[PDB]
């Protein structure tokens, strides 16, 4: 009932936890997110995400699908800007069969010409569906506006590339980024000796391996949604800095979203700030993204098209308040309780815990128990929070919007 963690000579982290539950769940996490694409292979990691049931050396495309379904299985693939994660769930008696599959897909895909060719239109489908959620518009643009290089890359292949990702490119991406050095093999409901064993033999992939440069920019998308999404961010702090915890707390001061169904959000600075003047449909939330080597911090509005000027300003002003001192301890206590509570809740599940343990394994090289985390959140000073707010107001801005942007301001309109 304790997390066991080991690192191999070759750099591969292994974490497990025998909780003797009826279900077993294994993740292979990989420093292989969209940030690792260059201007020449854009979209490759997207295709790679979609491609997990193509034929491998060890099992046919048919065998992966039928074999996993036989036993009530699930094989699944997640990407952020920085990581990819291959997860298998099943009943505990069959982890053997699923590990076999997981190792095949990550260790020896074949990416046959005809299968890859065939999968190409899926790029468009998966992308098209994704872009239905207008948050994805704004957020992907936002990253593109903010950075010039890696974190700039969108997670979904750009149109000009759909049809045009090659077998060779898929191969290169895997061979170059799926290396022992850049993987974490996480395991809930299995024995740690057996994970070590598996990783020693089967994840022995010879280590085949720029800082993200935030520049600041602005990207507008005209349509006629009549609701305008906008995000406004400044450079923040990377994960693992105590600055990072400062921003996280500032996020929860300003308000990152609702705690009550149909809520008024009495406790959200931002929400009440907007609402003191504009009395119609809107939403607002602090945005906080913290990456290996950078971070974005700010807020996101959803306003009427006509009201976006009035809303974005009202929101920005609220952050200026914090930056110029106005923050009670009541407020910062509320913030920390929220963050503390929300953290613990986010690791309530098998899903959430696995993601956290694997996440940390890559990012640091270690496990931080929830107790220590809470200490680090308690350890943030109201001065640190006022500093983080100061940092945003004064820092160089990146912005992205979409909607009928008639009354949506440019950065240089404050």
């Amino acid at each position: 009932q304790d997390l066991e963690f080991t690192r191999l000579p070759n750099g591969l982290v292994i974490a497990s936890l025998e909780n003797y539950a009826p279900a077993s769940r294994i993740g292979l996490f990989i420093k292989a997110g969209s940030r690792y694409e260059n201007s020449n292979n854009l979209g490759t990691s997207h295709l790679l995400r979609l491609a997990s049931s193509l034929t491998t050396k060890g099992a046919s495309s048919f065998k992966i699908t039928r074999g996993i379904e036989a036993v009530g299985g699930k094989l699944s693939v997640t990407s952020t800007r920085e990581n990819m994660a291959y997860t298998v769930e099943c009943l505990r008696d069959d982890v053997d069969i699923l590990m076999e599959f997981l190792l095949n897909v990550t260790t020896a895909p074949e990416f046959r010409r005809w299968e890859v060719a065939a999968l190409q239109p899926q790029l468009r489908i998966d992308k098209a569906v994704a872009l239905q959620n207008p948050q994805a518009h704004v957020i992907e643009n936002l990253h593109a506006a903010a950075y010039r290089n890696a974190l700039a890359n969108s997670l979904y292949c750009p149109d000009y590339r759909i049809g045009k990702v090659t077998p060779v490119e898929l191969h290169d991406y895997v061979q170059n980024h799926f290396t022992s050095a850049r993987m974490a093999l996480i395991g809930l409901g299995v024995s740690h000796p057996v994970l070590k064993q598996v990783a020693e033999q089967f994840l022995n992939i010879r280590g085949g391996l720029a800082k993200a440069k935030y520049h600041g920019g602005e990207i507008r998308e005209q349509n006629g949604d009549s609701l305008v999404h906008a995000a406004l961010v400044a450079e923040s702090a990377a994960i693992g800095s105590a600055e990072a915890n400062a921003f996280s707390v500032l996020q929860h001061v300003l308000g990152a979203g609702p705690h009550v169904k149909r809520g008024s959000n009495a406790t959200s600075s931002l929400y009440q700030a907007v609402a003191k003047g504009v009395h119609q449909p809107f939403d607002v939330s602090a945005f906080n993204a913290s990456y290996s080597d950078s971070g974005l911090f700010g807020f996101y509005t959803i306003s009427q098209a006509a009201s976006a000027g009035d809303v974005i300003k009202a929101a920005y002003n609220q952050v200026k308040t914090i930056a110029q001192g106005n923050l009670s301890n009541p407020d910062v206590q509320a913030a920390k309780n929220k963050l503390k509570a929300g953290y613990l809740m986010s690791v309530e599940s098998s899903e959430g815990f696995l993601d956290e343990v694997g996440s940390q394994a890559l990012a640091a090289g270690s496990y931080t128990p929830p107790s220590t985390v809470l200490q680090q959140i308690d350890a943030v000073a109201d001065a640190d929070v006022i500093n983080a707010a100061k940092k945003f107001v004064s820092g160089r801005k990146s912005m992205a919007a979409s909607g009928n942007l008639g009354h949506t301001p440019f950065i240089d309109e404050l």
Partner: peptide
């Protein structure tokens, strides 16, 4: 969307995570 109630909880604060599966819909 035609009301604050329904609209709220849309404002993003998660940098995005794309997840696609074998036998579970994409998100």
């Amino acid at each position: 969307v035609l009301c604050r109630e329904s609209l709220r909880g849309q404002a993003a604060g998660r940098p995005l995570v794309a997840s696609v599966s074998l036998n579970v819909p994409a998100s």
